[PDB]
Every structure is written in C-alpha cells, then in structure tokens.
C-alpha cells in the first residue's frame with residue numbers, strides 16, 4: 073500500500089556528473105565515454121563566433137577532485153560537446169531519447185558537478201517543467217531507466233519569469249518555443265494531462281479509494297467537449313488503449329472512469345481527498361502507475 | 371525558483387543493497403563493511419509470526435542456512451547475531467562500495483529518503499517523514515522488507531530506518547539500524563494499530579516560510595498570537611503542540627523573511643479557520659507537513675522574492 077511520487081534510483085547518473093567552467097561561468101556537465109555534454113551558454117549571442125575564439129584549455133572540467141583534460145570541442149544545436157582525454161569508467165549503458173509532453177522523468181539536480189537531490193516531474197503540455205532549481209543548476213539532467221539502460225531525455229538550460237523551467241533533449245534541441253538567451257519569453261497557457269489524471273484515479277481505486285466512482289459512462293466525444301472547457305488535454309483513442317490494462321484490472325471501463333472525472337470537474341471534491349490530495353494529480357503516467365503497483369526493479 | 375519534494379541521490383545506498391533468503395522467505399539486506407543487516411523476521415514462517423520466539427528460532431540455524439546475494443555473486447555467511455529486531459550476518463567479503471556512514475535514530479517530524487527494493491534490487495526513491503504516531507506513509511509491496519531510510523549530509527550517509535511491516539491502515543512500521551522499533555510496535559502479527567495521527571506544526575510553518583521566500587504572501591494577516599493561544603486552536607485541528615524549541619528552530623527563516631514566528635502562527639490559525647478559498651500555496655491545496663525547517667533552508671534560496 074501507499075502511493076508516492078517516486079523517482080528512479082539515481083546512482084547510474086551520479087557517476088556521470090562533472091563541473092564545467094569557462095571564464096566566470098560554472099555549470100554541470102554529463103560525462104559519457106570520452107565526451108562531456110553541457111549547455112552551450114557556458115561560453116556566454118552568436119555562439120559559433122564565441123566558440124571559434126576559444127581553445128581547449130579555456131574549458132576547465134572537474135570530475136570529483138580530478139581535473140579532466142579537454143582535447144577537442146564541437147557544438148550540436150544548443151549543447152556543447154567537450155572531447156576529453158579520459159573515458160568515464162562509470163559510463164552506464166545509455167541512449168539519448170526525446171520525450172513527448174505528458175511523459176514523466178527523474179531529475180538529478182546538481183550544483184558544481186555535485187548531485188544534491190532527485191525528484192520526479194513531467195514535461196508539461198506547454199513544454200516547460202515545474203522543477204526546483206537555483207543558479208548553478210544548469211546542465212542538470214532528466215532521465216528514465218528501462219532495465220539497466222539509462223535513457224537521457226532532458227538537460228536544464230533556463231528559468232522563465234513564472235518560476236518554471238526550460239531545457240533541451242541531449243542532442244541540444246529545445247522542448248518548446250524557447251531560445252538560449254536573455255530575451256522576453258514566457259511559457260504558454262498550460263493544460264492538465266488527462267490520460268495521467270485517469271491513471272492516477274485507477275491508482276486510487278487500486279489503493280481502496282472508490283468514493284468518486286459512479287454508475288455512469290460517457291462517449292469519448294462528450295467527454296472531450298467537457299474536458300476542453302476545463303483546460304484539460306483532449307483524450308485520444310490511443311490514450312484509451314494505453315489505459316486498457318488498468319481498466320481490466322479494476323473492472324472499470326476507461327469511459328466509465330471519464331464519467332467520474334467529468335463529475336469531479338463540475339462538482340469538486342466536497343471536502344474529500346484522493347490519495348491524500350485535494351487536487352487532481354497529473355504527473356503519473358499509466359506506466360508509472362503499473363510500475364509502482366508492481367515491483368519493477370533496476 | 372520552485373519547491374519540490376526532493377529525495378537525496380540514492381547511489382551511495384544502491385551499492386549496499388543485497389538479497390537475503392532463509393528457507394522460503396526472501397527480503398532485502400544492507401551490506402556495510404563485512405556485515406549484512408536485515409529484519410530478524412526473515413527466520414520466521416507466516417505461522418511463527420503470531421507469537422515467535424526469535425531466540426529459539428535463531429539457535430536452530432547455522433551460517434549456511436542464510437543465503438546472501440549481492441548482484442550475481444553469492445556472499446558466504448561466517449557468523450550471525452541478533453541485536454533487538456535486526457539480524458546481523460557476518461560475511462567473508464567487505465563491501466568495496468561501503469560509503470562513509472552513521473546509524474542515527476530520528477524523532478517524529480524528521481524527514482528522510484527511502485530506497486524501495488525488491489529481491490536486493492532498488493526500484494525507486496521517495497521522500498517521506500516519521501509521523502507523530504511513529505508510522506511512515508510509504509509505498510511498499512510484499513518483498514520490500516529491509517528497504518532503508520536515510521539522509522546524506524555532505525559525503526556521509528545517515529541510516530535512520532529499516533522497513534519491517536505494513537499495519538492494517540496501509541501505513542508502515544520499522545526500526546532504526548540498531549533494531550529498536552519506532553513506536554509501540556512489535557515484529558509480531560498481533561492486533562496493533564497506529565495511534566491517531568496529527569499534523570507536524572513546525573513543518574507546516576517552515577513550508578509557509580518557504581512560500582514567502584518564493585514570493586507568495588496572500589495568506590499573511592496583521593495579527594499575532596501568544597504561543598498558548600496558538601496551541602489551544604491548533605489542538606482543535608489535530609495539529610501537534612508547538613514548543614519553544616520549535617519557535618527557536620524557526621528563528622533563521624523568521625529573520626530572513628522578516629516575519630516573526632508568532633505572526634506566522636497567526637496566519638496558520640487563519641488558514642485553519644478559513645481554508646484556501648480556491649487558492650494554492652506552492653502548487654498545493656492542502657497544508658504540507660513533510661518539509662522540515664532544515665529542508666526548507668537547504669532547498670530554498672538565501673534571497674527572498
């Protein structure tokens with residue numbers, strides 16, 4: 073029993089965190105094999121003009137108490153790739169993956185190449201993440217683990233005026249319409265991840281919370297007409313198919329649970345909670361619910 | 371900016387998790403130097419759990435009855451002893467991944483990270499608090515016994531909890547690493563229930579100061595209160611009494627934000643009376659009590675917004 077916001081064990085990622093310094097800027101880098109990956113703004117804009125003026129010895133890379141020697145450098149989109157002399161002996165099995173909004177991941181927040189905390193979060197529909205970062209956190213990474221392979225999906229770059237965060241995949245492509253520079257940019261209006269709220273309602277049923285269930289069902293079209301009015305993402309047939317296993321386990325059809333979500337949206341909770349929460353939670357995917365309500369290990 | 375429920379990086383603890391098997395029971399163990407620590411109920415059958423005599427069950431065992439597995443390697447058990455509700459298995463190999471560590475016993479209201487494991491393999495990490503009734507609201511399934519709670523201060527891992535059992539309400543009970551249970555609980559399947567739970571007042575206050583540091587002041591008022599009048603009101607909402615020690619501990623956050631502890635106490639009294647009125651505090655519609663004053667200073671900036 074119990075339902076917590078759970079992150080993946082961070083050990084395989086901790087062994088990759090390094091400190092990168094260029095002049096007066098200090099941020100975090102990801103050391104995989106003989107390459108250190110970090111935000112290109114560490115050189116700060118015309119990034120190719122700023123980069124051509126730098127030499128290998130201008131980049132100071134520190135792994136623990138050891139200084140790594142930079143022997144080459146190149147840029148790929150908004151990420152800087154620093155070739156080093158030493159391959160990381162702690163390099164795990166890994167892949168670089170680009171996630172979609174609504175997907176969740178673990179974040180290992182670092183300052184000065186040292187990991188300080190781990191938390192779970194989701195890529196919002198507006199492509200921002202509601203993270204917890206201070207100055208020096210740039211270059212901190214987001215990841216998922218599938219068996220023994222770490223899938224790197226996010227690298228932190230900046231904070232927006234509303235306190236939310238923006239970053240790139242590990243190939244340096246931004247999530248969202250953002251740019252790496254000091255300019256007027258704001259997060260778009262955000263929406264609730266409908267397939268995630270539904271998965272979290274199934275997790276509540278699994279843990280013995282059934283007060284919100286009703287005898288009613290709905291059509292997918294009628295549900296979406298209601299959901300659009302509460303700034304909820306449209307629910308697709310793919311989402312319905314993905315919720316199939318949880319529907320079969322609890323005996324509650326996906327459209328049956330949608331009628332419960334419609335009633336919660338029009339009437340509220342009435343002084344009640346679901347899994348210790350007075351809000352409808354949208355940062356657990358259907359896979360996160362199945363993984364936590366089973367013993368999947370790494 | 372931002373305020374998340376943050377756990378400590380789990381790497382130093384992952385390198386200590388092992389699988390312990392005794393007959394038909396399989397659970398987790400903590401391998402530190404040449405000793406593996408695990409719940410003593412690994413020697414029990416499900417029947418035994420009603421009224422087990424652990425001393426009588428242990429005397430009948432030999433070193434080779436305990437199978438210890440670290441990754442794909444089998445560790446050899448060369449000795450065994452019992453210390454309260456924990457079994458200590460002496461092994462023939464010291465853990466090369468042993469971090470700098472200490473065994474600490476925490477008090478209710480304190481927080482810690484939990485590395486949940488099944489079959490000696492870590493599956494997830496989460497943050498939680500020791501409740502006033504000495505239980506923890508964890509996320510554990512069968513096979514999680516022996517999973518540990520910890521804090522990492524500087525490069526040292528302070529082990530404070532080892533998981534032993536799930537009570538009938540879904541809450542969890544366990545021991546410190548010296549095998550002493552937190553709460554009036556026993557490693558017996560007897561009729562035992564968690565005491566009435568209460569809100570950790572000093573933690574809710576710390577969390578209100580974290581919201582002021584992040585720029586939110588909608589809940590503040592022009593009133594103050596006496597400590598006694600605050601406690602008479604707080605008791606009525608099942609909130610823990612606030613002591614002078616708690617007031618002293620909140621001093622740094624009070625000095626940083628410019629809001630006296632008893633003025634923050636007045637704002638809490640008002641929140642309990644009125645509710646939130648469709649508003650949230652740090653993305654939450656409930657008053658949060660699983661962040662200590664130390665957690666807030668650690669996570670939040672030193673500059674108020």
Ligand SMILES: CC1(CS(=O)(=O)N2Cc3ccc(Cl)cc3[C@H](C(=O)Nc3cncc4ccccc34)C2)CS(=O)(=O)C1
Nearest residue numbers: 113205206207209229230231232233251252253254371
């Ligand atoms: C104070 C702000 C950030 S900044 O001006 O300090 N900043 C400019 C800048 C521009 C482009 C790029 Cl790619 C990166 C950056 C940097 C940046 O965002 N860093 C930070 C990342 N994460 C958390 C941060 C918490 C506090 C301060 C900096 C944080 C530094 C936040 S705001 O109100 O939108 C402006």
Ligand SMILES: CC1(CS(=O)(=O)N2Cc3ccc(Cl)cc3[C@H](C(=O)Nc3cncc4ccccc34)C2)CS(=O)(=O)C1
Nearest residue numbers: 073411510511512514515534535536537538557558559
């Ligand atoms: C299913 C229950 C636990 S048990 O009867 O399987 N159990 C008895 C017992 C007694 C004392 C001691 Cl020290 C240990 C144990 C064991 C125990 O609690 N195991 C477990 C630990 N943590 C999470 C668990 C989630 C599900 C199942 C087992 C879990 C085995 C929970 S309940 O509904 O109140 C009965």
Ligand SMILES: [Cl-]
Nearest residue numbers: 475476477480
């Ligand atoms: Cl303590």
